[PDB]
């Protein structure tokens, strides 16, 4: 693509600059370029990839929710007809969101996941796959909605299976995967009890392993544990 002529190292350098400038669309385009060089990503590089796309899609999701709410209000009894514009613009934002998700899922399928053999990398990528199918699910209404939901579930489940076998219960990737899969259960799969059980069990297994950790690892793990607690508080 447009980044094909730029050195891998320069792309990664620029991604870091873009992050400092809060230019997340640029960050994402640089990281896509870096992935397309065909070499595996380091841990630092995986973090850059994830941050970039999280921020881009996060902004799209927030906009889509604003628009969807306006659209919903327009279809209530007593709302005066304002024409097709709200639906059209929601559709526009939705199509852009779907495109970003398809781009991320594309990078994971070609060929990040298949080349990832270490547990941390494979879990990280499979968690990402779950996440971007979950964003597709949030906006899905068609014949494929159940398959999209099941694609997220399958990715998250594979990641969970690997994480439980290969990583300690305090590992931040394991914790983050569990946090997100729990949100999937609550928000997407209509399974709040599964969501709660997962968050609680994850929190408690992590708590029991904190004693093994350095101060720096403890900080990393407890940050995500607090997110689990925050969700549990919201849900109970």
């Amino acid at each position: 693509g447009a980044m094909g002529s730029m050195e891998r190292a320069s792309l990664i350098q620029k991604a870091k600059l873009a992050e400092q400038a809060e230019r997340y669309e640029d960050m994402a385009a640089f990281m896509k370029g870096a992935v397309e060089k065909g070499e595996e990503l380091s841990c630092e590089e995986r973090n850059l990839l994830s941050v970039a796309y999280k921020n881009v899609v996060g902004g799209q999701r927030a906009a889509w929710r604003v628009l969807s709410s306006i659209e919903q209000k327009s279809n209530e009894e007593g709302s005066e007809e304002k024409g097709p514009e709200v639906r059209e613009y929601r559709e526009k934002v939705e199509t852009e969101l779907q495109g970003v998700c398809d781009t991320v899922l594309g990078l994971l399928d070609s060929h990040l996941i298949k080349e990832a053999g270490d547990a941390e990398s494979r879990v990280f990528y499979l968690k990402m796959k779950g996440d971007y199918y979950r964003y597709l699910a949030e906006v899905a209404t068609g014949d494929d909605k159940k398959r999209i939901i099941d694609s997220a579930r399958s990715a998250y489940q594979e990641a969970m299976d690997i994480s439980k076998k290969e990583m300690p219960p305090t590992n931040p990737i394991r914790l983050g995967l569990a946090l997100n899969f729990s949100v999937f259960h609550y928000e997407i799969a209509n399974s709040p009890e599964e969501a709660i059980s997962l968050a609680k069990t994850t929190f408690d297994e992590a708590m029991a392993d904190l004693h093994t950790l350095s101060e720096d690892s403890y900080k990393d793990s407890t940050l995500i544990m607090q997110l689990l607690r925050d969700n549990l508080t919201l849900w109970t």
């Binding site: 946090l179 949100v183 609550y186 997110l227 925050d230």
Partner: peptide, 5 residues
């Protein structure tokens, strides 16, 4: 909206 990472 619930927390995710």
């Amino acid at each position: 909206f619930p927390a995710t990472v």
